[PDB]
Structure formats: structure tokens, C-alpha cells
Write an enzyme that holds these catalytic residues in place. Structure first.
Site, short mmCIF file in Angstrom:
data_model
loop_
_atom_site.label_atom_id
_atom_site.label_comp_id
_atom_site.label_asym_id
_atom_site.label_seq_id
_atom_site.Cartn_x
_atom_site.Cartn_y
_atom_site.Cartn_z
N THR A 1 26.78 71.94 6.24
CA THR A 1 26.28 71.44 7.51
C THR A 1 25.01 72.19 7.91
O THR A 1 24.92 73.40 7.72
CB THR A 1 27.36 71.60 8.61
OG1 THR A 1 26.79 71.39 9.91
CG2 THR A 1 27.98 72.99 8.54
N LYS B 1 32.09 77.62 8.30
CA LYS B 1 31.38 76.89 7.26
C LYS B 1 30.55 77.84 6.41
O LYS B 1 30.39 77.61 5.21
CB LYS B 1 30.49 75.81 7.87
CG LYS B 1 31.27 74.60 8.41
CD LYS B 1 31.91 73.78 7.29
CE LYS B 1 32.40 72.41 7.78
NZ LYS B 1 33.08 71.59 6.73
N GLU C 1 24.45 73.15 10.60
CA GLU C 1 24.86 74.21 11.51
C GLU C 1 24.75 75.59 10.86
O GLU C 1 24.67 76.59 11.58
CB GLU C 1 26.29 73.97 12.03
CG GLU C 1 26.42 72.98 13.20
CD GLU C 1 25.96 73.52 14.57
OE1 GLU C 1 25.40 72.71 15.35
OE2 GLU C 1 26.17 74.72 14.90
#
Ligand SMILES: NC(=O)c1ccc[n+]([C@@H]2O[C@H](COP(=O)([O-])OP(=O)(O)OC[C@H]3O[C@@H](n4cnc5c(N)ncnc54)[C@H](OP(=O)(O)O)[C@@H]3O)[C@@H](O)[C@H]2O)c1
Ligand SMILES: NC(=O)c1ccc[n+]([C@@H]2O[C@H](COP(=O)([O-])OP(=O)(O)OC[C@H]3O[C@@H](n4cnc5c(N)ncnc54)[C@H](OP(=O)(O)O)[C@@H]3O)[C@@H](O)[C@H]2O)c1
Ligand SMILES: NC(=O)c1ccc[n+]([C@@H]2O[C@H](COP(=O)([O-])OP(=O)(O)OC[C@H]3O[C@@H](n4cnc5c(N)ncnc54)[C@H](OP(=O)(O)O)[C@@H]3O)[C@@H](O)[C@H]2O)c1
Ligand SMILES: NC(=O)c1ccc[n+]([C@@H]2O[C@H](COP(=O)([O-])OP(=O)(O)OC[C@H]3O[C@@H](n4cnc5c(N)ncnc54)[C@H](OP(=O)(O)O)[C@@H]3O)[C@@H](O)[C@H]2O)c1
Ligand SMILES: Nc1nc2c(ncn2[C@@H]2O[C@H](COP(=O)(O)OP(=O)(O)O[C@H]3O[C@H](CO)[C@@H](O)[C@H](O)[C@@H]3O)[C@@H](O)[C@H]2O)c(=O)[nH]1
Ligand SMILES: Nc1nc2c(ncn2[C@@H]2O[C@H](COP(=O)(O)OP(=O)(O)O[C@H]3O[C@H](CO)[C@@H](O)[C@H](O)[C@@H]3O)[C@@H](O)[C@H]2O)c(=O)[nH]1
Ligand SMILES: Nc1nc2c(ncn2[C@@H]2O[C@H](COP(=O)(O)OP(=O)(O)O[C@H]3O[C@H](CO)[C@@H](O)[C@H](O)[C@@H]3O)[C@@H](O)[C@H]2O)c(=O)[nH]1
Ligand SMILES: Nc1nc2c(ncn2[C@@H]2O[C@H](COP(=O)(O)OP(=O)(O)O[C@H]3O[C@H](CO)[C@@H](O)[C@H](O)[C@@H]3O)[C@@H](O)[C@H]2O)c(=O)[nH]1
Lengths: 344, 350, 350, 344
Positions: free
Chosen positions: B133, B161, B135
Site C-alpha cells: 500500500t 503493512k 500508506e
């Protein structure tokens, strides 16, 4: 001041418990799981698009439990959340232990960590699955336990950790030993709702045949809308005690199939043995029910029958809905459901 | 022989991934969580009234990314050739209140899944996609971001993550497992979760059009994202596993837009023009033609942190996979809004 | 009012940290694991026959970094002003076989501990040290490594510590908690765990000197490390918490030596000169004066991966903390070997 | 081919079980925890500095359990590893549940995952703590359970998950319901070794006074070196059954203090009540024993007495070491221990 916190508010009992307490004026809080889709279909009509407040949580996240209970400071706690399907527990035993067993401990620990030991009343959702291979007939509060599945063992742990908190810290905490309770909101995966939905779609031409497991099991079936009220009664008692809640009537999975089909005009007559047994409609000669071993359980609970004498005397509680009316209601409700929406 | 194991098959990406692989003749397996209600709405059409092609090609199994035994049993019984790990707690705001759970599923869970592959002796015969991601870039260190720009997460979601990214790389380097990270920027669709900004706007604009709602509120209106279509992006997941060698790829559109702009364009498809009045938390969006105020601001949709200047450079994916996005921002809004009117017209719930 | 909570107080660093803080008048609390045997040998001298100064100043509590309730109860009851998170599964080879456990303690465990601080409302009144590690640099991206060189872990241990690093930073940026990462390179001492290369060499060289052992085997002899003394490094932990603002620091010696060199020098303090014969796994180290072979190679002490060119640049620590290492490589070997002879002379076990 | 895998090999029972099986020629494997220090002091003399092989592990790491059992392919499994201190369990209830409860499930699951269901024999270390608030006197295999602590509840879970695996998959798996067993290797934290070490150091001038909790509890005490053998006997049986192992004799914590001091020449006479009670030596007038409420338990197990008739008949097993000889041995051993090393 009446403030209730319900775990598993999105389930069957939770949705009825929320209406019940809401009607009595309570402020009702509930812990819902994050979902990639909607998971609040049983309770969404209680928004007033109010007196019900939902919080994200999970019985395996210790920090979130403390944060919620401290923020809400409830006066009554109902721990209804759990992985509740006995069959699924055989292939999901670890998660079922973490949630049904350890999850009960995590919640009690949170009550002690927030300092509410002396100001909260705690209801545990116990189950007739504790009796498993029954040691007496009927079963009462003093009958020895003997669970028969990973779900039984987790709940047996949860029963005794609750007793330990009551005896060791004087926490007002009770075990509701409730026997099977069904309703039009009963999960689709349980035998009573599996039958009622299937019979309903057959009557509407949306289905021809469905498959079951052990036809010869016998259960004590009551209505979930009655049993929620017994949970509330238990916390209004003057002493924290444990209670059995049941109807006292026994019936087979076989009978439940027969009565259900009867309410659509069909009379079932059985042919064959064991996993080759089938159910044929006497009037049309069409086969509608077959048996498959993949719905059996490695260790079965064969016979269950509750004796709620203690609850009748000490709580003045009695069941209002009997077996026959239960089948009639479920079959009728799923007809109206599937008639207006065949994807239901 | 092509058989896929998909975790998180009930979510947005997984449902579209199931469709994509089934059309190519794959045999598709998915892991679904036990639920007290139905939770398979996104993929129900594939095993109820399906096409003659791919009728008996999808099978579902009860499991959870925190249950180590059930993962071993499923992987051993299915023996897949490709695994797509899309299961996760995926909301960034919710991770601030659910940090431990998000760690056990998004971080440790990836490790449980790789460990299952090693336990079943499939290290050398399986291909593993990990859902990474943008992110991970948190406090962006380059503009735009590419595969080599260093990470700096800003949430418990990002941190988890971030753990999954490096544990996947470790299995690649230590045991020569074919394992890739898809570094995907935001991707939406008519199946996006209602709690995400785009579907929240599109669903409410719909309900306002049909007289089912008057007003809704957002948080930070001036936030910007890089927005693509999920159906395009699942295709890049498959390409990454078709590559001769396991490499990590950024997947994005490279064009950035603001949630404020998303709102304006959404309302335009319903016949209404927005003009903004007021400042800060008292800012409101009013319809020019009716004078009625439809958008307000509520401080509770902010987050403890915020992600700044996201913009993906997927040059590498263009060269080595020959992949490019087919849907642009304008059509994404158009499609989403149109889809939710048709949905909310026939049923006023969701 | 100065009261410290130390996790992992029974290990190397924690025991020396306890001594350091108690001498300054701190009140020291530690978390110890339940054990079926004694596991407090390193700190036993502090609460058995202690000095008149700091007699009743150390208290121990049963806990575990995977038990969320016990952490809340301890933190709430102790209400500390400084927390040092030194508890961990710290062996890098063992983490390849124990990856899930190492993740739950080293990664999620840090998050459990910070969450306890937030739960007890101490976010604004506590100072938090995290035990980071040069293992975060894995495949080194600069030579030497400083605070700004990007990370690249190469083990499950590194990945977990990588998660702990970023979760600590997130609590710092999101909630303004005073939280620092100590990026410490290898540090040893007479209390180092026997399973680590230095103490393994020093203990065996001792036992060979006393006729208690003939021969021992290592893995990769040509591996290089940056080696300091643990008693110096605990002092830098305390300085980092005395800083006006929370910052991260590298702590190292900047001089790099090989395990092969460590062996040679160790044997020199026992009167023996090593000459190496043979190649690869058949390489052996023989004593010049006796002809007897004391060192062999065993492939099972290698690891799936290896960490390359470690060398710390602690310029920042010199300027902002005025800290410098007091012990050098020569004295570290000298001290360790001497210490284990005296220990093994009086008792032939350990 | 005889290959045994022992969990908690570093504990008391594990160390004796390893000698026992080693002597019978078995290949013995064991799961040890990583420690920052040495944790193998009970078994290190079994190295031959051989037939015993140790592996790093933990009852909470699912992957490591599968890797070990698949690598070792044992024919007998002894699950002795656990957090075993009842008192510590009250402030460590979560970890104790994860290890003692769920850990038993993780190990059974690993046996099924490796495909050894039909070729392995599995011993579970159950405990008289299942009887807690005893429902019969004496206690036998058929006495209803009633645990009294977080440790009791975890073991009750572990008992029934083992029964469920035997009944549902035909796993040869048994519960050893063993009552208290002590020895010179008994943990320092348990009342019998706490007393023997303390009395020993008093006799040598290394200590003057030590503190206990509830003096009036009564226990059935046997010798751990006898009970390991009963574990082996249970897996040599032709049918997997559950057994109680005990001595049948009852004694108080009070008596155990008196007899221990007697073996150093001192006669204890009690004065005061409850937490102000003390024990003074009749001959010297010195006080050596005081009481402190921090060693009490929120819910106590007051009286325990085992009836091992079933084990005597079906296994021809009987205890060889009685109460008196047990005290004499422990006190004597700790004297020799502390005489040659006062830090012991
Ligand atoms: N009868 C017994 O008495 C109770 C009432 O049964 P019922 O028939 O109403 O069950 P119902 O079918 O299952 O509902 C179970 C409830 O528990 C929730 N739940 C499950 N796992 C959870 C977790 N990890 N964290 C938080 N909540 C969780 C479910 O959420 P979801 O809706 O997201 O599945 C749901 O709200 C049950 O405990 C059952 O054992
Ligand atoms: N980008 C990738 O995709 C996500 C974002 O969009 P999306 O559509 O893929 O996400 P999404 O729609 O939010 O779906 C997440 C999926 O993960 C599943 N999941 C969550 N927790 C799980 C657990 N403990 N075990 C197993 N499955 C679990 C969910 O099941 P439910 O349907 O029951 O929620 C759902 O299928 C990111 O997080 C990343 O994974
Ligand atoms: N560098 C920092 O220090 C370590 C390296 O040298 P060191 O001397 O500090 O390490 P060390 O000597 O190996 O000590 C590790 C410490 O952590 C404790 N620990 C391990 N797992 C734990 C758990 N689950 N809960 C609580 N405590 C736990 C250990 O207790 P035991 O004594 O029982 O092993 C021990 O006190 C690195 O890992 C990093 O933490
Ligand atoms: N009596 C019952 O019958 C059994 C025998 O009792 P005993 O008196 O010999 O007990 P003993 O005092 O406690 O030994 C307990 C053993 O279990 C081990 N253990 C604890 N937690 C563990 C974990 N998480 N993973 C792996 N091993 C773990 C301990 O290792 P450590 O040596 O590292 O503490 C030790 O080897 C016990 O289960 C007890 O409940
Ligand atoms: N679900 C199911 N059960 C079947 C089937 N065929 C036969 N059965 C039998 O039908 C009986 C009842 O099954 P369920 O309705 O699944 O419920 P249960 O095992 O009795 O479980 C419920 O009862 C407890 C008391 O309320 C609860 O504790 C538990 O959570 C659950 O709600 C069991 O003996 C089961 O073997 C089938 O196709 N499906
Ligand atoms: N959800 C939400 N977001 C809002 C709102 N008002 C403003 N926003 C802003 O809208 C932006 C996008 O939020 P989502 O679209 O809500 O999340 P992300 O934080 O963009 O997360 C998605 O991106 C990641 C990678 O694309 C994924 O990892 C994650 O799962 C998710 O799909 C953020 O800047 C958020 O602050 C509101 O009412 N709701
Ligand atoms: N333990 C060990 N290491 C050996 C051996 N033979 C060679 N080595 C090599 O010796 C080096 C150092 O190993 P330890 O000193 O064993 O570990 P690290 O991998 O150096 O770990 C330490 O450093 C980190 C930061 O300093 C810490 O995080 C970690 O906990 C530990 O303290 C590594 O290159 C290892 O391959 C042997 O027999 N044993
Ligand atoms: N430990 C301890 N117990 C004390 C003390 N003072 C009084 N007691 C009492 O002494 C009795 C026995 O205590 P322990 O020796 O701690 O053991 P237990 O609770 O009986 O536990 C053991 O017995 C079971 C059967 O063998 C085991 O399952 C369990 O793991 C443990 O080994 C209990 O009633 C306890 O209250 C004290 O200072 N310490």
C-alpha cells in the site's frame, strides 16, 4: 441510571436484547466488528436515522475492551459475542478457543482493570452444550458437565472463569445456561433456519432439494425473544446465581422437517437408511430431502432436555412460545421473506 | 494447472480478482470468516446463477488469518499454484483504535501464511502476492514515489503493512520463494466499502438525488489522493505473478485529486453545483440552484496523523509488465455515482 | 522523584541498567518471567547482600510481554517516570526457527507496552526508551551507517524490531509521547549470553585453559562486527532520556573486527598462538606451541542470511549527549577471557 | 522403535521422566524455551558432554510445534509444559490460559496436521486442581470437577479437549489426574520446597525467619519420582483411559512445617491467630515462622485426598514413598545443598 454494554449485538440474541432494554429506557451500547461489508442488518432499524451507540471492537483485542468499558462505564454487561456454530468449531478450534474461552477472561479482566468490580453486573451466555453426553435426564443446574466439541470446551472454560470471578472478587456475575433458542433471525446455518428457508423456497418454486446430517438428534427448542428476557431477570435477582433456561419439551430434527413441510401442504415419508436415507413428498412423489455425511459431527450431542424449575420459582419466568408455534412462525416468515426477495 | 488461493475474497479487490481468474479458467479458492449474517454479497453472483463457463470453479473455506492450524489445513488440501494475500483490516482511521488487532492480522498474519507454505513443503512450487500500500510512504520522502523511495509509515496500519512488506522480502531472499509486493495506491469502484471517502460521497449524493437524505458530513476536505479503478488493478496483481522473476511494483495513476473536487464532480452528475461557504469546521457546501446545504464538516472524521503528497510513478510496471490504467478520474466518479443511484433506487438500504 | 520500569531486567543490558539507575538513587522496578528454575542470576546481588545505599530500591513483578492485562496492572501500580523496553527474544539465528514468537514479543509486544501507557493516562508524564538494533540496517545502504541511512532488515528478528521502531515513532508523532529509539550496535560483557559469538569464544577458551575442554566449533569465521561494552551503552540509554527533546541515536564504537580476530586474541591471553589450516568447512585452528587443534568449523552455526559491513557513526550522540565509549576491543577480549577463567576455575559449570 | 517427545522437559517431572525413559533405551526429545540465561539445570547431567535431543520451542508458537513433531515423528508424547503455579495464575491469568489451555490444543492439532493421529500415544498432565472445591471425599475419576483458579480453569479446558480428540479421531490420548508430587527438584516457590529450604538454612545459621500463608490447608503429597512411572504405565495400557494418581494420605501445611523443623532438632509451638499467628521454637524461644496475607489465595482449595483404586487394579501401580520419608528427604537434601553452597 441504566447503561448496558452488549457484546455480539449484531447476532440473534443481541438484536432482541437491544430492543428489550431500549424499551425499558436503557442506554444501550454494543461492540461491533469491522467488516468489509455491512454486518448490522439485525439492528439497523434501531438508529432513528439515538439511545443505541455502537463501537468497533473484538474479543481478542485487550486494549480496545478497556477503552470501551472505561468510556461507557456500564451498569450491566451482556457477553453474547462468540463463534457460536458447533460444527464450524471442529475445523476452527483455535479461533473458537481464543474468542469463546479467552475472550470471556479478557472482558472480566477489563472490568477489574477499570475498577468497576463492585458497580457492574455481568451476564455470561452459557449453553446446554456443557452437558454434551448428558449425565442425567433431564438436565438441571447440578448436572455434571461433559462437553463434546471444541465449542463445548471453550464455553466450559468460560463458565468456570466466570464462577471464579464471582467467588474471588464478589463480582455480581452469572451464567445463563440457555438451551436452543430459534427465531426468524436465527442464522441460516443452523438446522432450524436451514429447514425453514429451504421448505419456503420449495413452496415458491425456487428450490427442489436440500441436504441435512443426523436426522435422529433430539433438541429442546424455545424462542429467542423469550430467552433474552430471562437474561435481564437474572441480573435483577438479589443474589448472583446460575440458571437453566429451557422448555422441557424434546423433538427430533426429523420431526422438525416433517412439521415444516406440513405447513406448505406436503407430507414427508422416509425411505432408505443412514446416509442413503431420503425424504419424499407423499403427494407428488418428488424427493426434497437427502442426507450427507459432511453435516455430521465427529462427536454428537444426541439428546437434550432442560429442567428450569429453579428459574420458574426464583425468577417467575416461563416460556411463552412452544415447539409447534415456533415452526409455524419460522416457515411463514421465510415465505414472506423469499416471496418479496428471492436472494434473501 | 492453475489454482488460486485468495485471502480476503469477500472484499473489493478479492471479488474482482476472483472474476478475473475464473474467466481465465483458473480454479479459485477463497478464505471467508465465520459471520452471524451473510457476508458474501460481493461474490454471491459467481456460485448462484453463474455463466456456463466457470460454474464449479470456485470453492470457499472457513478460516481466519489468526488461526495457524486452519491455514495449514487449507493450504495443504488445496495445494495452490498462486496465493494472493488480500485479507486485512484495511481502514486507516479504525487502526488507531484497533492497533493490536490490525497488527495481528495485517503483520503477523502475513507471516502465518508464508509459514504455512514452508510447512507444507510448497516453497518451490507456489507464487505469492502480497497486498502492499502507498500508506508505506507515509511522510513521503520523494515526489513522486517509486519502488526505491524509502518508507516512513504514519499509522498502525502503515506500520503493520511495513512489517508484512519486509517479512515477504525475507522469505524471498532467504528461501528463494517467488514472492512480490504490490505497492498499490488508492483504488475504488462500485463495490468500495461505504466507510471509505469515495463510496461515502457517491452513496450520499445518490440518496440526496432520490429524496432519501438531505445532508452529510466529511472531515478534511483538502486531502488529496491518487485514485484508480480496482478492476484495472487486480489485473496488475496477476501480471506480477506472470513475470519471469519476482519483483515489486508501484501501481497508480500518477494524477492526484482532492476530496473537495470529488464532491463537486459527484454533485455535478446529479444536476447540482456546489459553492463553498464558511471557514474551517464551519465550512459548508451549498447547492447553487436550490440554495440547500448538503455538505458539512465534522471534526471526528479527521485522523491523529495525515498522509501528504501521494503520487505514483509506475514507470517500471509499464516497461516490465506492459500495464497501464484504463479508467480515469472523471469516469470513476461518473461510474460510481451512476451505480449507487441505480442501487438505491431499487432498494433504499444499500 | 525518579522511578524506572525495566522490561527484560534479567538479561545483560537490564542488569547493568538496574545497577546504573540504583546508584543514582532511582527506584527500580523490573518485569520477570515465571520460570521452573531460578532465572535472576544476573541481578541476584542487588537484593540479597546489597550496599547500604540502595537496599530497598528494587522491586520485581511477574509478567510477560504477551499478557496485556499484566502490563496494564504493573504500569498503573508503579506509575513510572521512565520506561526501558529491553525485553525481547534477542538471538538472530533462533528467530529463523521461532519467527512467530519473535514477532509477538519483539514487535507486537512493544505496541502492548505503549498501549498500556496510553490506557493509564500517562502519555504526558512518562519517558520511553526502545531497544533498537543495528540489525535494522541488514543489507547496509551506506558505509558507515548513521541515523538517516535507510533500513533493510534481513531476518525475522530485524523485521520485528523494524515494526517496533516505527510503532514507537508513531506514538511520538501522533500523541507527543516522549519516545526514543536506541540504535545500538553489538555490545558484550562478562554477562553476555553463552549463545552469542563472543561469550561462546571466551567461555570455551577459558575451559580449554583449565583442562575442562579440548575443542569447540564456530560457523562463519570471517564475519565482522562493531563491538562495544554493554556497561558503557546502558549509560547512553539514560542520556537519551535526559535529552531536552526525544531523538534517535546510533550507539557504536566505529571500529570493526572479525570473529577470527576475536579467537586469535582470546587464545593469546591463555598463552596459545593460533595458526589456521585447511579451507572452508575443513578449516581448523591449531595451537603453535602444542600442535593441538582447538577450533573447528560446523556448518550448522551459519544462518539463512548474513549481515555485511556494519560500522556505526555516532557523531550525533557525541554532540547532543556528550557520550563516547570508554572500552576498546583489546580490553573487551582481555576482560571477558579473564572473567570466565575466574568463574570456571571456582565452578566448572557456568 | 521407541521415540518420546516431552514438553516442559526442564521442569521437575520432565527431568525424572527423561531419566526413566532413557534407562529403558528410548530416544528422548524435549522442547526447551529460549532463555537469556541457563534454564536446563535439572537435565544437563544427561548430555554425556547423546540419546537426548533438545529443541527450541514454545506452547504458543504453532509453526514450531508442527516443525518439531514432523522432524521427530515420536511414538509417545508427554505434554508436561505449563505455567504451573496456582498463585501466580491469579495475576497471570491470560498467559496461563494461552499456555495451559490453548497450548494443549495447539499440540493435539499438530499431531493431526502431521498425520500421526493413528501412530502416536499422547499423555496429558492433568491435576487434582480440577476437583477444587471437592464434591466427594475422597476424589476418584468420576467425581465432578469444580476448579478454583485461573490455573484450574485452563487445565479443565485441557482435560476436555484431550477427551474430545480421543473420542472424535480415536487418538490414543489419556489424562493423568495426578495429585501433588514433590522432590528435591521441586520448584522453590511451592510450599514444600519453600519450607525445606528455609528450615535448612536456619539450621546452618543462614536464615532466621520465613513467611507462609494459609497454614490449615490439607494436601495429598507423593514423590515425583514415583509418579513419572505411572505416566509411562498409562501409555502401555491396552485402552486409553484416565487415571487418578495419589497416596490417599492427608496432611496439613502446618504438619509439614512441624515435621521439617523436627528434623533439625526444633519443636514448633504456635501462638496467635490468623495473620498474626507465629511459630516459635520450644527449645530456644526464637520465632522462625510468620504469616502474611500476601501468600493467601482469593479462592482456596481446602482439602484434597486421592483414591487411586482404578490405577492400582488396572496398572498394578502403587506409591513407594510416604509422607514422612518425603519430608526427611527434602530437608536432608537442602541441608547438603546449602552447606556446600549458601547461594543455592
Ligand atoms: N447460544 C449462545 O449464546 C450466545 C447467543 O447466541 P446467538 O445465537 O445470538 O449467536 P449469533 O449467531 O452468532 O451472534 C454471535 C455474535 O458474536 C459476535 N462475535 C463473534 N466473534 C466475535 C469477536 N471475535 N469479537 C466480537 N464479537 C464477536 C458476532 O459478530 P458478527 O456479526 O460480525 O459475526 C455476532 O454479533 C452465543 O454466545 C451462543 O454461544
Ligand atoms: N490493498 C489491499 O486490499 C485492502 C484494501 O481494499 P480491499 O477491498 O482489498 O479490502 P477490503 O474490502 O476491506 O477487504 C478486506 C478483506 O479481508 C478480510 N479479512 C479481514 N480480517 C481478516 C482476518 N482476520 N482473517 C481473514 N480475512 C480477514 C475481510 O473479510 P470480511 O468480509 O469478513 O470483512 C475482507 O475479505 C488492503 O488492506 C490491502 O489488503
Ligand atoms: N539490544 C536490546 O537488548 C537485547 C540484546 O541484549 P540483552 O542483554 O538486552 O538481551 P538478553 O540478555 O537476551 O535478555 C532478553 C530479556 O528479555 C526477556 N524476555 C524475553 N522474552 C520475554 C517476554 N515474552 N516477556 C518479557 N520479557 C521477555 C528475557 O527474560 P528471560 O531472562 O526469562 O530470558 C530477558 O530479561 C536486544 O534484543 C534488545 O532488546
Ligand atoms: N502438576 C502438573 O503436571 C505438570 C508437571 O509439573 P511440574 O511440577 O514438573 O512443573 P515444573 O515447575 O513447572 O515445569 C514446567 C515446565 O513447563 C515449561 N513451560 C512453561 N511454559 C512454557 C511454554 N510457554 N512453552 C514451553 N514450555 C513451557 C517450563 O519451562 P521453563 O523451565 O523455561 O520455565 C518447564 O519446563 C505440570 O503441567 C503441572 O501443571
Ligand atoms: N447445523 C446443522 N445441524 C444439523 C444438520 N443436520 C442435522 N443437524 C443436527 O441438528 C442438531 C442441532 O444443530 P444446530 O441447529 O446447528 O445447533 P446446536 O449444535 O444444537 O447449536 C446451538 O445450540 C446451543 C444452545 O442454544 C448454542 O450454544 C450453540 O451456539 C448453537 O446456537 C445437531 O444435533 C446437528 O447435528 C445440518 O444440516 N446443519
Ligand atoms: N473515510 C473517510 N475519509 C475521509 C472523510 N473525510 C475526509 N477523508 C479523507 O479521505 C482520504 C481517503 O480516505 P480512505 O479513502 O478513507 O483512505 P486512505 O486513508 O485513503 O485508505 C485507502 O488507501 C490505502 C491504499 O490505497 C489502503 O491501504 C486502505 O485500505 C484504503 O483502501 C483521507 O485523506 C481521509 O482523511 C470521511 O468522512 N471518511
Ligand atoms: N552465536 C554465534 N554466532 C556465530 C558463531 N560462529 C560465527 N558467528 C557469527 O558471529 C556474529 C555475531 O553473532 P551474535 O554475536 O551471535 O549476533 P548478532 O547476530 O551479532 O546479534 C547481536 O546483535 C544485535 C545487535 O547488536 C542484537 O539485536 C542481538 O540481540 C545480539 O545481541 C554473526 O556474524 C554470526 O554469524 C557461533 O558459533 N555462534
Ligand atoms: N506456594 C505456597 N503455598 C502456600 C504458602 N503458604 C501456604 N500455602 C498453601 O499450601 C498449599 C499447597 O501449595 P503449593 O505447594 O503452592 O501447591 P498447589 O496449589 O497444591 O499446586 C500444585 O499442585 C497441583 C497438583 O500437583 C499442580 O497441578 C500444581 O501445578 C502445583 O504443582 C496451598 O493450599 C497454599 O495455599 C506459601 O508461602 N507458598
Amino acid at each position: 441510571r441504566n447503561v448496558a454494554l452488549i457484546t455480539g449485538i449484531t447476532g440473534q440474541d443481541g438484536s432482541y436484547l437491544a430492543e428489550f432494554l431500549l424499551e425499558k429506557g436503557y442506554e444501550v451500547h454494543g461492540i461491533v466488528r469491522r467488516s468489509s461489508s455491512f454486518n448490522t442488518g439485525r439492528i439497523e432499524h434501531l438508529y432513528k436515522n439515538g439511545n443505541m451507540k455502537l463501537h468497533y471492537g473484538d474479543l481478542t483485542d485487550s486494549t480496545c475492551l478497556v477503552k470501551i468499558i472505561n468510556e461507557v462505564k456500564p451498569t450491566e454487561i451482556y457477553n453474547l459475542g462468540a463463534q457460536s456454530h458447533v460444527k464450524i468449531s471442529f475445523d476452527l478450534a483455535e479461533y473458537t478457543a481464543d474468542v469463546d474461552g479467552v475472550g470471556t477472561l479478557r472482558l472480566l479482566d477489563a472490568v477489574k482493570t477499570c475498577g468497576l468490580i463492585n458497580s457492574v453486573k455481568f451476564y455470561q451466555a452459557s449453553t446446554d452444550e456443557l452437558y454434551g453426553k448428558v449425565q442425567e435426564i433431564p438436565q438441571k443446574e447440578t448436572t455434571p458437565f461433559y462437553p463434546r466439541s471444541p465449542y463445548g470446551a471453550a464455553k466450559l472454560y468460560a463458565y468456570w472463569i466466570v464462577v471464579n470471578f464471582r467467588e474471588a472478587y464478589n463480582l455480581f456475575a452469572v451464567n445463563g445456561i440457555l438451551f436452543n433458542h430459534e427465531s426468524p433471525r436465527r442464522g441460516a446455518n443452523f438446522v432450524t433456519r436451514k429447514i425453514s428457508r429451504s421448505v419456503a423456497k420449495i413452496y415458491l418454486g425456487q428450490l427442489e432439494c436440500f441436504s441435512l446430517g443426523n436426522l435422529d438428534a433430539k433438541r429442546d427448542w424455545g424462542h429467542a425473544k423469550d430467552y433474552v428476557e430471562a437474561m435481564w431477570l437474572m441480573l435483577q435477582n438479589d443474589e448472583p446465581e446460575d440458571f437453566v433456561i429451557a422448555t422441557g419439551e424434546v423433538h427430533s430434527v426429523r420431526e422438525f422437517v416433517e412439521k415444516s413441510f406440513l405447513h406448505i401442504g406436503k407430507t414427508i415419508v422416509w425411505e432408505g437408511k443412514n446416509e442413503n436415507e431420503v425424504g419424499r413428498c407423499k403427494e407428488t412423489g418428488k424427493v426434497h430431502v437427502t442426507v450427507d455425511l459432511k453435516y455430521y459431527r465427529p462427536t454428537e450431542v444426541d439428546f437434550l432436555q432442560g429442567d428450569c424449575t429453579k428459574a420458574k420459582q426464583k425468577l417467575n419466568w416461563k416460556p411463552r412460545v412452544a415447539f409447534d408455534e415456533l415452526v409455524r412462525e419460522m416457515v411463514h416468515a421465510d415465505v414472506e421473506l423469499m416471496r418479496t426477495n428471492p436472494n434473501a
